[PDB]
């Protein structure tokens, strides 16, 4: 699902294929380093800091699954764990640096629970700024003091 | 895309297949360690410190994509990041040593933003000497004090 | 046998399939991260801090074996050893942190001897709070000063 | 010759096939982790801290040779050397910890000279408690202050 | 070729099958830990500190080859190198400890050039006491200050 | 190509099969540790510190290739790199100790560029004494202060 969004040879973020859409955090500079994906029609929402595009048939096989079911506990991401409690995601400050946008936070069954956009460093833990689902909806949860990765 | 250019058993640089051409920095000693590629007709420009050759049909599948879209920000390369600002690329002095020619600097979507030729060490940062694109053109940006890798 | 019980993306404990039932410590927040298991009919006992459910035919193959035969000596668990003496289980303080509920303590032949619920830290050793068997019965042994993991 | 004697997944000692019998130190908890060997008829002597069983034809090939010829000097064991003098075996304190029962002490020609049961730590050297041969007999030599391994 | 000579469970030296004979340094206590070899007729020479026995047909396949051709240079042994110069063998003091008798020193083609009996520690180098060949003869070279291993 | 030249069990140098001849530095004591090679007719030149012999048909397959093409740059040898500039070879003082004669210095394509005979230690770099080719000739380059390895 993760496809990197390059900008003049510099990887600036990522783009996941979640379900039937190709998502990419709007704030991220650059184009998707996949020919087919770059050529698509992207719709941009500044509200959700998103910029999605409906996936082509031949890529739907590589499309990941998403979910709203996000019980308190621990999740997985590129940089290890993600504590999830209080409708809030957190990672140990320093695991996520800029350039980590568009990465998915998934459960142990693979399902994508949310997509990182940035994070508010609050001591030992950074409270992640995310794009999450909600009973057939796409919400956006963002903490005060949040940077954009 | 990267194919190493050997010289008497010593790897002296690299050669990327960007788009429909096989590029290789002219200054680099040796031949490409790929049978098919070595046998091609190479045209050499001393202006761009380049020596390209139009890719054979069977290798076009392994051909990478390139781009002029290079917004300020961060890029990826073999040795980590590449700061890109002021129409200038930079890496932390010491990441790129000689023998790193022909390596591509790409964005997060894979697209090749530029190709390293060498670099001018200016303290903590080395300003890279590169071959970059420009709205259907191949330009060459090189800083004063530049060595050839 | 171990299946993790997630709560909003945060793993809060575990659930083992011991024999013909699927056990889970009642105190644990969340749902079992296995589709089939979540959908079952769970009966809850506050007496035993348990919440079991009779296993479906297709999962009985992955069902572990249990036993009352627990002679003094050493047992195995996720975090190494477990001293067992005086009808009491103990682990070196610090091996078991919260989030370790529902984990089994087994013998060298695989049989599950007990299931952790929490533990009373008493110096170098923590005396474990467990669910154990007893000649075709399910007992619960818990020490004073016990926390819930 | 060495076959480990497991007890609830915990290796508690060993069992060697010396000559035509399968020996095992009686004090050791558990069963032999070899199907065929477990099923045999074991005779137990509390005098010699032994529990032998006459070897099956198909295993006699893997049966080791034993000997009474034990001249003063050095012997081999799992944990290096064994000083042998004064009708006494010794190893540097700390080489043999509990769980080392049933291991053989052999000569440079392979012959098994004795079988460890435990040992009396007497400073830098521990004087081993052993089962040894004696002109077609099985004797047992044990020092004061001996533990059982 | 190497077969260990055990003494009451303590390995005291070794025995190599060189050519058509089974050699063993006479000074070594114990019996050969190979049934067939122990049962043979051994002839002992105190002159050569040897005790050879003509090899049985079924073991001749595992018999090693020997040679008198020993040009100055380096040889191989269990404990690395062996300098050979001045009709003298040497190893760095400390490579060979007692219990290393009967070990062969061979060339890069496998041929056994000599058999260790002991050695005279003379500083950084120990000059080995050996049994060597000499145009269809078995000689014995031994340095002043030699111990027996 | 490299075959070691032993002397009384002590490896004193080497012998490479370069092209159609078997070369060996004349100064080296001992015989080649290869039966077939030892039996050949060797011609010795004191001028070139060489002692070559025309290779037998069955060994010509294992014969290496040589070359006069030696452009300034870096070469390979047993002990790493070899700087080559000013018609001179050099290695960092200490890489080549005595006993390194007859070793080849080759290019990245395998071709043997020269054969070491010894070297003049001149500080941090030792300027190698070599046997090199020259448009269908065998020359010998040797620096003042050269030892023989």
Structural summary, described in words:
- The structure holds 6 chains of a larger assembly.
- In chain A, the strands form 3 sheets. In chain A, strands 8, 9, 10, 11, 12, 13 and 14 form a 7-stranded antiparallel beta sheet that branches. In chain A, strands 3-4-7-6 form a 4-stranded antiparallel beta sheet, with no helix packed on it. Chain A has a 3-stranded antiparallel beta sheet with strand order 2-1-5.
- Chain A is mainly beta and 149 residues long.
- The first copy, chain A, has one helix spanning 35-38; strands spanning 3-7, 10-15, 17-18, 21-22, 31-32, 43-45, 50-54, 73-77, 80-84, 89-92, 104-106, 112-122, 125-133, 138-141.
- The first copy, chain A, is globular and about 40 Å long.
- Chain A has 2 domains: 1-64, Trypsin-like serine proteases (Thrombin, subunit H), CATH 2.40.10; 65-149, Beta Barrel (Thrombin, subunit H).
- Chains in contact: A-B, A-C, B-F, C-D, D-E, E-F.
- Chains D and E meet through strand 8, strand 9, strand 11 and strand 12 of D and strand 1, strand 2, strand 5 and helix 1 of E.
């Amino acid at each position: 699902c993760i496809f990197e969004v390059k900008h003049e040879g510099k990887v600036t973020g990522y783009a996941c294929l979640v379900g039937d859409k190709v998502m990419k955090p709007a704030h991220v500079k650059g184009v998707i380093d996949n020919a087919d994906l770059a050529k698509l029609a992207f719709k941009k929402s500044s509200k959700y800091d998103l910029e999605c595009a409906q996936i082509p048939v031949h890529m739907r096989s590589d499309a990941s699954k998403y979910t709203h079911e996000k019980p308190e506990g621990h999740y997985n991401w590129h940089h290890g764990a993600v504590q999830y409690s209080g409708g809030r995601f957190t990672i140990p400050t320093g695991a996520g640096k800029p350039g980590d946008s568009g990465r998915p936070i998934f459960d142990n069954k693979g399902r994508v629970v949310a997509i990182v956009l940035g994070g508010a460093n609050e001591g030992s833990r950074t409270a992640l700024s995310v794009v999450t689902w909600n009973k057939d909806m796409v919400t956006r949860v963002t903490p005060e003091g949040s940077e954009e990765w």
